Amino acid sequence: GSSGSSGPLEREGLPPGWERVESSEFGTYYVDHTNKRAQYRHPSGPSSG
Amino acid sequence: GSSGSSGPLEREGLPPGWERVESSEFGTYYVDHTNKRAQYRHPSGPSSG
């Protein structure tokens, strides 16, 4: 329930299909199997609809 | 020393900046930090000059 700036993370787990990668050189990133891309923010989809 | 088609892998390590991601839902894949893309093949290109 954002007040104008939703969080970049929610502490919760990723959606089914998203993977989190963790290392010492880069820190932590996320990969999208649906689009074969990498990002640094948490993913966002309509879990209920 | 290819004599037909380049192999799937040479068992060697990855270049500085690339990463390997291991899973079970997907098995194993690789990610590029230069283009933020994901692929299932081992990377390639030059290494000296």
Curated annotation (Swiss-Prot), chains A, B:
Top-rank taxon: Eukaryota
Post-translational modification: Phosphorylated by STK3/MST2 and STK4/MST1. Phosphorylation is not required for SAV1 stability and may increase the number of protein binding sites on the scaffold molecule.
The name this protein goes by in its record: Protein salvador homolog 1
Localization in the cell: Nucleus; Cytoplasm
Source organism (scientific name): Mus musculus
Gene disruption phenotype: Mice show progressive hepatomegaly with a 2-fold increase in liver mass relative to total body mass at 1 month of age and a 3-fold increase by 3 months of age. Embryos display unchecked proliferation and defects in terminal differentiation of epithelial cells.
Part of the full-length chain shown: 231 to 266 of 386
Tissue expression remark: Ubiquitously expressed in adult tissues with the highest level found in testis.
Binding partners and assembly: Homodimer. Stabilized through interaction with STK3/MST2 or STK4/MST1. Interacts (via SARAH domain) with isoform 1 of NEK2. Interacts with ESR1 only in the presence of STK3/MST2. Interacts with WTIP and AJUBA.
Stretches assigned to the WW domain: 12-43
Task of the protein: Regulator of STK3/MST2 and STK4/MST1 in the Hippo signaling pathway which plays a pivotal role in organ size control and tumor suppression by restricting proliferation and promoting apoptosis. The core of this pathway is composed of a kinase cascade wherein STK3/MST2 and STK4/MST1, in complex with its regulatory protein SAV1, phosphorylates and activates LATS1/2 in complex with its regulatory protein MOB1, which in turn phosphorylates and inactivates YAP1 oncoprotein and WWTR1/TAZ.
